[PDB]
Amino acid sequence: QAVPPVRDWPAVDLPGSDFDPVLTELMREGPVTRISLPNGEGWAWLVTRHDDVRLVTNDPRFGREAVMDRQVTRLAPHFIPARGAVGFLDPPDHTRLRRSVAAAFTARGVERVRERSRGMLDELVDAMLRAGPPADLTEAVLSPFPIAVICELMGVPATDRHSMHTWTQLILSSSHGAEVSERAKNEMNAYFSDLIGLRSDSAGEDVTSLLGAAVGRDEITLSEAVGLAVLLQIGGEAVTNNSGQMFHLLLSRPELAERLRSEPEIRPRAIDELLRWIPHRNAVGLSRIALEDVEIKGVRIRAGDAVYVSYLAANRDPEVFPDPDRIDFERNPHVSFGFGPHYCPGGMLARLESELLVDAVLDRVPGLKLAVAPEDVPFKKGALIRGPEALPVTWHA
Ligand code: HEM
Ligand SMILES: c1ccc(-c2cnc[nH]2)cc1
Ligand SMILES: [Hg+2]
Ligand SMILES: [Hg+2]
């Protein structure tokens, strides 16, 4: 028990939204297990229960700053966040940086861009309807919408949306092992250095304006501000893959789609349940290092050891979610947006986007449905975040 066997967790592409069989086995073995991923060196501890995941992610004894130096076993060939980025920061610095933009990401904060976002979405959907079926829901709506929304919230001119997306793709491609010069990945860095440091020098409510003002008041450095802007910009694109899984599920189970289309009142609750259930990523992402000797469920974890949490596993904890594999719109303390200091700042924005998307796609498109069999919809390979490559759809024209 104190010395669990190391389980090898090689990279494997899973069909649609099927749950990882290896994760299912780890969940059955006990609260604390040990794993070895494709990259990095050695092994790491893993926790899967809802309460243990909340502990590891919300306790000062586990830190992110120490992860970078020790080649911890991991899925990705290379990390996305750089040294000093919020992902690799611990309080107090992490707290100081996150607070500079927190008010822009709460429910009250994201409401500011809700009307404009709904307008942009209706234009994308209407353009799709006008062109006629069949179409690729991902290329026509799910991909462009999130990019436009995060750029709007950040204060990035619409004319630069395409550039932002290309830069985001290069950075993510680099994580997959692709060879990209630092000079290539720092283009977004230079872009935000200009926007935050030279422009948006006046009063503003968008994210880059808040960052610029915080730098002006000596609360954060330009470097800290730029690093945060880059990660927020990249993060905004996650809604594309997640909403893609959401619609693949809804269209694969016409019954659920009918329920949402006919019962507007339950959409908020239903979307929250889909967010809990959808297996958003492959394996696990960034670990935390035990900063001192600690114990979890009696298991001794030595200072220096790496510990991963699986939010996907925690979302299926039988204790917290009875009959976990069942999607129940009337079920929900899920942790799809993480837990602890590092919880996703984009959670409320993702909810906003998901709600607008469900409304538009289910109410504006006459008799929407998949144009191919559920099993024939291609999903991303060798990826970190799971999602459809395309979503062929048709409707009444
Ligand atoms: C359904 C969509 C999304 C999901 C499921 C999601 C999920 C997550 C998860 C699980 C984490 C890791 C928490 C940890 O490190 O323990 C995270 C971090 C993060 N997400 Fe998201 N996210 C989504 C959308 C977004 C969006 C739209 C943005 C941009 C506003 C964003 C920005 C970030 C940032 C900056 C972090 C790093 C936070 C930190 O380490 O302090 N996310 N997200
Ligand atoms: C890899 C791992 C996590 C993410 C992410 C977190 N929040 C939004 N995107 C993006 C790429
Ligand atoms: Hg963008
Ligand atoms: Hg994620």
Q: What is the resolution of this structure in A?
A: 1.5
**Tokens for 20?**
């990882």
Strand partners, 290: 62
Residue nearest to atom 27 of ligand 1 (CA): 236
User: Are residues 327 and 273 in contact, defined by beta-carbon separation less than 8 angstroms?
Assistant: yes
Report the alpha-carbon distance of residue 92 to residue 90 in Å, rounded. 6
In one-letter notation, the amino acid at residue 8 is: D
Q: Method of determination?
A: X-ray
Q: Residues near 179 by Cβ (< 8 Å), separated by ≥ 6? A: none
Q: Which domains, from first to last, does the chain contain?
A: 1-397 (1.10.630.10)
Indicate whether residue 345 lines ligand 2 (CB < 6 A). Answer: no
The gap from C-alpha 251 to its chain's centroid, in whole angstroms, comes to: 22
3-class SS shares of the chain: helix, strand, coil, % to 5: 50, 10, 40
Report the alpha-carbon distance of residue 311 to residue 337 in Å, rounded. 8
Measured between alpha carbons, how far is residue 116 from residues 144, 236, 351 in Å? 14, 16, 16
Report the alpha-carbon distance of residue 75 to residue 83 in Å, rounded. 18
In one-letter notation, the amino acid at residue 194 is: D
Protein residues with CB under 6 Å of any ligand 1 atom: 57, 86-87, 98, 150, 231-232, 235-236, 238-239, 242, 280, 286, 311, 336-338, 342, 344-346, 349-350
**Tokens for 167?**
């830069």
The gap from C-alpha 67 to its chain's centroid, in whole angstroms, comes to: 20
Q: Cis bond leading into 60, ω under 30°?
A: no
Report the alpha-carbon distance of residue 80 to residue 393 in Å, rounded. 33
Parallel/antiparallel/unpaired status of strands 294-296 and 32-36 = unpaired
Q: Residues near 338 by Cβ (< 8 Å), separated by ≥ 6? A: 57, 311, 344
Indicate whether residue 274 lines ligand 2 (CB < 6 A). Answer: no
**Tokens for 155?**
């204060």
Report the alpha-carbon distance of residue 174 to residue 185 in Å, rounded. 8
| Ion ligand 3: protein residues whose beta carbon lies under 5 Å | 147, 150-151, 164
User: Are residues 234 and 80 in contact, defined by beta-carbon separation less than 8 angstroms?
Assistant: yes
Cα(232) to centroid(ligand 3), Å = 9
Report the alpha-carbon distance of residue 277 to residue 337 in Å, rounded. 12
Half-sphere exposure of 326 (CA within 13 A, CB side): 8
Task: Please give the number of the atom of ligand 2 that sits closest to the Cα of 172.
Answer: 11
* 207 SS3 class: helix
Strand partners, 7: 35
Residue nearest to atom 20 of ligand 1 (CA): 344
**Tokens for 258?**
């009918």
**Tokens for 271?**
């979307």
Report the alpha-carbon distance of residue 374 to residue 397 in Å, rounded. 22
**Residue 76 dihedral angles phi and psi, to the nearest 5°:** -75, 140
Query: Breaks in the chain at C–N > 2.5 Å: after which residues?
Result: 331
156 burial via Cβ count (<10 Å: 0-12, 13-18, 19+): buried
**Number of Cβ within a 10 Å radius of residue 134:** 13
User: Are residues 244 and 138 in contact, defined by beta-carbon separation less than 8 angstroms?
Assistant: yes
User: Are residues 375 and 15 in contact, defined by beta-carbon separation less than 8 angstroms?
Assistant: yes
Length of the chain: 397
Report the alpha-carbon distance of residue 30 to residue 238 in Å, rounded. 31
Report the alpha-carbon distance of residue 56 to residue 314 in Å, rounded. 12
Cα(183) to centroid(ligand 1), Å = 25
* DSSP class of 41: B
